[PDB]
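Example with several molecule types.
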Amino acid sequence: VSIWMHPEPAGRRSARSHRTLSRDQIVRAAVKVADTEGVEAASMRRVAAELGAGTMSLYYYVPTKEDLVELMVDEVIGETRLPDRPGPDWRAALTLAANEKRALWLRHPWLATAWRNGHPVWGPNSLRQQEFVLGTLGVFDLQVDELLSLIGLYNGYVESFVRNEVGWLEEARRTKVDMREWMRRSGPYAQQLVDSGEYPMFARVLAETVAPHMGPDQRFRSGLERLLDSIGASLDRL
Amino acid sequence: VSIWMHPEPAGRRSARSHRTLSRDQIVRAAVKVADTEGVEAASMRRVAAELGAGTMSLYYYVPTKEDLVELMVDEVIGETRLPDRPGPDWRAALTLAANEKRALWLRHPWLATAWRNGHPVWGPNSLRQQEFVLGTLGVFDLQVDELLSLIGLYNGYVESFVRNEVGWLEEARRTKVDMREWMRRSGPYAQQLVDSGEYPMFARVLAETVAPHMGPDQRFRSGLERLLDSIGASLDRL
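Resulting structure tokens for the full complex:
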């Protein structure tokens, strides 16, 4: 039985506060905690505390922590809007989806780790989003493995970019030193590296590394357009 | 003062076992623990236990946990071999480096999280590896931002691919259910999804998702060659 078909029990009223619990109340409460504190803090006991319920009342709806994270992932994917069908402009569709995905990860940074370690999430919101993405390239004459490879290249670009954004943001929360400040403090050492002459490529790219001309929103898009051009090239050959 | 120039104190002999400690003994012991148990288990106290030393003796060489992970990352990067110069064949060089990187991550799966959340690691092994990579494309006439964008596309492909490999491996360690077994158990649900007709793209790609014709080593390479072709195309335009 997949946790996606696992029959949800009737809403049950407790004797603590006397409110009624359900699976999706528990998953939303778990997302609210993870959004500030990370997936690790969103323990069944913690989420039970957030809802004023006994922890055992939660297990009745969500049997394990691992099941809770799976539910949480599919639940936040459902905030994404995209249209029902991608339409005739595949670059446009993939761009809309990439924008929406980046914004999703930024709202929920624990995705930049929860999103596919191992098994794929086959809940309804993830499946719908994947039909839209796969659907953009499914109109062309590709073998399955060509299709997955190209969507893989697209997914990896989007995910790698936003994982790095999230990593800096998360670092700043932990250390109180953000990207700007880090780059300022590393200035003297970077100059030592440059003076040594040992790292001519490092020296070449430092200015743009330390203080890029384009911000992340611009860079996300420029690299995306490059990625899309080359998919367009793979589609011309075929 | 960068932890990369931070002057290492003389080797100090303890009164527990009576052995001499040094920074690189501590970092190697920390890698040995992380390699089996993850970065989180490789606490200063745990690594101190691995070495039979008092935890305070470790802080004398490595002041924080965060400094220890940075050291650990650069230390494992030094297992990579690559040649001193990339040579005239840029696709070859980038392929060698990608192979070596994938193998590194597989030997040290905690890299698939430790490797650039936030700030870049500017220790000697990481800088050397980056000169080799950046150096392959530095021979051409690109602006800095074109160069970083293309190396970004390359890095994201390699890192996304191996992060997913590591995620399954890590899942299998935790759950004792590996990719094959997962796919077998999800068979019935996948058939329900297919029967519904709601997910025609899911249905199209299932066979290749559940039991791919090509293994990861083959797929890594085929996608890499595609990525390299398109970099070759960006270089033709310029």
